[PDB]
Write a protein that binds this ligand. Sequence first.
Ligand SMILES: *[C@@H]1O[C@H](CO[C@@H]2O[C@@H](C)[C@@H](O)[C@@H](O)[C@@H]2O)[C@@H](O)[C@H](O)[C@H]1NC(C)=O
Ligand SMILES: *[C@@H]1O[C@H](CO)[C@@H](O)[C@H](O)[C@H]1NC(C)=O
Ligand SMILES: CC(=O)SCC[N+](C)(C)C
Ligand SMILES: CC(=O)SCC[N+](C)(C)C
Ligand SMILES: CC(=O)SCC[N+](C)(C)C
Ligand SMILES: CC(=O)SCC[N+](C)(C)C
Ligand SMILES: CC(=O)SCC[N+](C)(C)C
Lengths: 533, 535
Amino acid sequence: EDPQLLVRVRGGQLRGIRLKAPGGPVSAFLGIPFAEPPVGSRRFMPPEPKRPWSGVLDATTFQNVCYQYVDTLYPGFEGTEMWNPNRELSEDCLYLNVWTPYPRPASPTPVLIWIYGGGFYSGAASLDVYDGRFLAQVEGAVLVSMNYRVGTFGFLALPGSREAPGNVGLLDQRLALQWVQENIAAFGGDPMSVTLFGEAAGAASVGMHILSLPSRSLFHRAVLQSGTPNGPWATVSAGEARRRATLLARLVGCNDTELIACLRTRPAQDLVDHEWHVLPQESIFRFSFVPVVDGDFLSDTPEALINTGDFQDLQVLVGVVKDEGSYFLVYGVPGFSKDNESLISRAQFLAGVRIGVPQASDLAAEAVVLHYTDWLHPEDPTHLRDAMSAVVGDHNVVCPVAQLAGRLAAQGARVYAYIFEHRASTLTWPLWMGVPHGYEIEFIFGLPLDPSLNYTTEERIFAQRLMKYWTNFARTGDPNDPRDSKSPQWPPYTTAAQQYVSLNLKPLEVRRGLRAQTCAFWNRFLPKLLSAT
Amino acid sequence: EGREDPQLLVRVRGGQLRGIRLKAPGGPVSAFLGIPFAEPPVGSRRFMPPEPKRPWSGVLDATTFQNVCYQYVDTLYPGFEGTEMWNPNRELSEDCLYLNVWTPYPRPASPTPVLIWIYGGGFYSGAASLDVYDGRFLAQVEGAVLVSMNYRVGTFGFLALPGSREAPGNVGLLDQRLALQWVQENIAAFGGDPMSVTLFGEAAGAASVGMHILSLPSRSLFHRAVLQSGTPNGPWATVSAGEARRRATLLARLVGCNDTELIACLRTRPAQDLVDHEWHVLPQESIFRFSFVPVVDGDFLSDTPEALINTGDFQDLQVLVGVVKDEGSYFLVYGVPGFSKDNESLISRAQFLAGVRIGVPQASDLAAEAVVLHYTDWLHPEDPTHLRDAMSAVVGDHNVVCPVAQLAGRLAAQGARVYAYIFEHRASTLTWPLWMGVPHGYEIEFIFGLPLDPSLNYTTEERIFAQRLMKYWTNFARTGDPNDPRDSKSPQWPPYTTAAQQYVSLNLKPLEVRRGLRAQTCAFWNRFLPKLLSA
Ligand SMILES: *[C@@H]1O[C@H](CO[C@@H]2O[C@@H](C)[C@@H](O)[C@@H](O)[C@@H]2O)[C@@H](O)[C@H](O)[C@H]1NC(C)=O
Ligand SMILES: *[C@@H]1O[C@H](CO)[C@@H](O)[C@H](O)[C@H]1NC(C)=O
Ligand SMILES: CC(=O)SCC[N+](C)(C)C
Ligand SMILES: CC(=O)SCC[N+](C)(C)C
Ligand SMILES: CC(=O)SCC[N+](C)(C)C
Ligand SMILES: CC(=O)SCC[N+](C)(C)C
Ligand SMILES: CC(=O)SCC[N+](C)(C)C
């Protein structure tokens, strides 16, 4: 019995497992329950705290993945399968994972809490790219990650109902945050220094905790990688959530109480089978069951909340990858595939814009096409393919990020911004997709430090830099190395200078203006257009 | 005759003329100035098409410039060369339909290609007698026969009650056409070749050239065309029949006046009364807009210039078109609060938004916002230097650059041989402030070769630059190709096409080929704003 692997938390005793990182051992406590299983009558309901347990709970293995849609586009292909569930699916999935140094920290250590993405319809804390051991071992970090409910199970809402009030997957996340405040000190973690970080829907989730008062007492800093609470996909209105839940019920053969009661009888896969059938248009980067503007978790729209919020005591790190949109094009836009160059016609570009900007009117779509066409090369398939990616990336991630960065800065927050421009040497998606959505994560988590994974020496050195920025941010709210001189420093993002950095194999380079002209199109003009028309 | 210079006596259809020997720097040229080409359009003839001049008896003295057509005279900056150089330099009169001819001295012995100049001035002003339109350098140095005519401007040239007999519209264009007919019949008497006539003009003169391209009876009267900083299409060069009628009717009311009865009453008014009220009829507070301009009458213009350039067959056409670096800047001090020639005109964002309503006067609120958003530098949205320069760009692009881009594209797509330039040299002697850059009109003095006159104080490099330009323009006149058929060593000027969109920089440096005439921004003005308009 290794006493470093025995911890007493409020619910009882746990036994962890010693894992081997390249530089040495780490302690892992995996599959720790933070809620009562949300099964049976508890489906669609807020999470309840986990009851205490007898004896020593085995926390040596990852628990089940929350029940979800499994991707089938490219069976056996690593680029898609690396995101698919890697443990059995179950509604009984409300567990979290903690990595710490071995031996455990002698003094209170800054905590990083990871919230995974997956469109609010997928994801798991057990994926290889979210492996917290490198950060634990190399940077001495205490790293936590939780499973939260996704799809109908996490986000189906009949707003105003007792039995399906909405946003319960976010409440799962919050309960895990409360768990950390109550228990993380037992692992050597510092509850007075907690940094949330996440990517895509996970980043949107972090943003929602920034915008919801009860969460604000549970953390001190935030990192939003490639996602935001504002923007076209992260939230729905109460009316649209109700429509979707009501249509789904209809499709599976089902007064809110009666409707929700019948949905609770349905096998989990019956719900998932119809998950994608309730979206209002044919689209990409759109997800059926997402956080809802309920007037409770979210007191108003994220747009409203970011415009009027006071963010003076907040430090935030935000950014994007170079090719945010490319991934999504193979899931809906004719002409696109991983298995060829996806050189498209102008006709295919105009068709794709309707799918990539599915809420756009004819005129708005026309403006998108006119803005993104290179009028020197208006029919060039390479330009048109790359423009399609840009439209989807900018509409869904880059311009929402720019908007958030600007508002948070204007309203007193300390903001740092980046663009991530390095394509992993071992990437299995084609060259044309560039640096796609999701492919900074393996570097931030430090995977290239494992020589068995076949990254280059330069990628290992780059990962070590990134882990340092992130953990320095965790320690101080400033990603710069506190001892260590050398220009260039990473300056805060401001509305005046709009400074951000490129994260690639070259030294930090400071740039100004995050797609400034194009995001003015999306953030200023298109709103004026559809409010008038 | 008997004691006079025998090399200056010429007969035309209306009778005998006596010209004058002028000194150009390289030698003598012949000038026949103030030749009448129409009956004076006075009295009962006001607003009416021109009638051919009746023959005269004896020798007509053609040694001086004739009257300038009655027009508004700029008072913005009294005494200032930058404005006064465009003001009338002879007596204002409605008796003004005269033309000028310059030729080598002695006159050429074999038929010589002819260049015909049509001046600009917003269709409300201008004169063929201005110093910058002096044909002596082209005639002396390039051996050109150069012709320039006065044409009626303002109400006198362009007031229309469409469908009426007494004020049918477009009479200033008909004045131009009659001068072109005069050249066909008479220019051989001077050694000019009626089978090689090239029209060239700037601003409204360029617009006029374009309307001759688009009007059937003009097409037999010339062979090639040059449009400098102006087009027949675009927001200022034409009005609809209904708008012309509205303006004519309002003007009549303002001066105290059934179309016959209305026009009869307008014919009783002093010319100056019409001039004094002509600015009062524009529908908005605006710049780069003019009250009395060509009308889409279904006659001279059978359809809008837009329609005609979209459907026309221009296979037999060769055209040279282009713009200066700062088309808009001039106009800002005539209407946009915050702008002046006597300070740097650094403006606020508020003054930029206000300016956009004045510079894009027909724009709805949404379109104006589209413009502001496009032209704002979102890295420096409040910087007064960028805002000033953006105000200029808005007005230049909207009114000249994007209309030219549109014209060059349609013409090339529909069979024309098109050559395109941007002129980027600022005259060393320019009296307008530096912030205005290379303003509208300030290429002309170089095309006409004024720097060849040492008394004018241009630089040596400016002289060499002028000589190149005159070569380009005259080579184009001669052959439909501005390139020298000898000189393969000099860089070549490629035709503008829709595929490659090539055009050249005209400056002190050897020709540089560039691609795309404001391609992205002109997509906004020419493809997006029109689609917005439809709803
Ligand atoms: C630039 O000038 C604009 C026009 O005002 C005229 O010129 C200036 C220099 C004054 O002498 C004034 O009396 C004239 O009427 C002004 O609107 C503008 O404010 C001036 N720019 C600045 C701030 O110096
Ligand atoms: C040319 O320069 C001289 C000498 O300074 C000056 O007197 C004359 O007025 C200038 N000529 C012109 C055309 O301005
Ligand atoms: C199951 C997986 O994560 S695939 C491994 C891809 N990686 C080593 C480049 C992150
Ligand atoms: C709890 C564990 O260690 S699972 C195996 C994870 N690995 C594939 C990244 C090594
Ligand atoms: C494209 C998607 O929405 S899922 C892919 C996995 N990821 C989002 C977590 C990176
Ligand atoms: C009356 C005039 O033309 S003054 C301008 C003279 N300049 C064009 C040679 C500078
Ligand atoms: C409407 C005007 O711009 S008048 C200025 C003189 N110019 C046009 C002939 C150069």
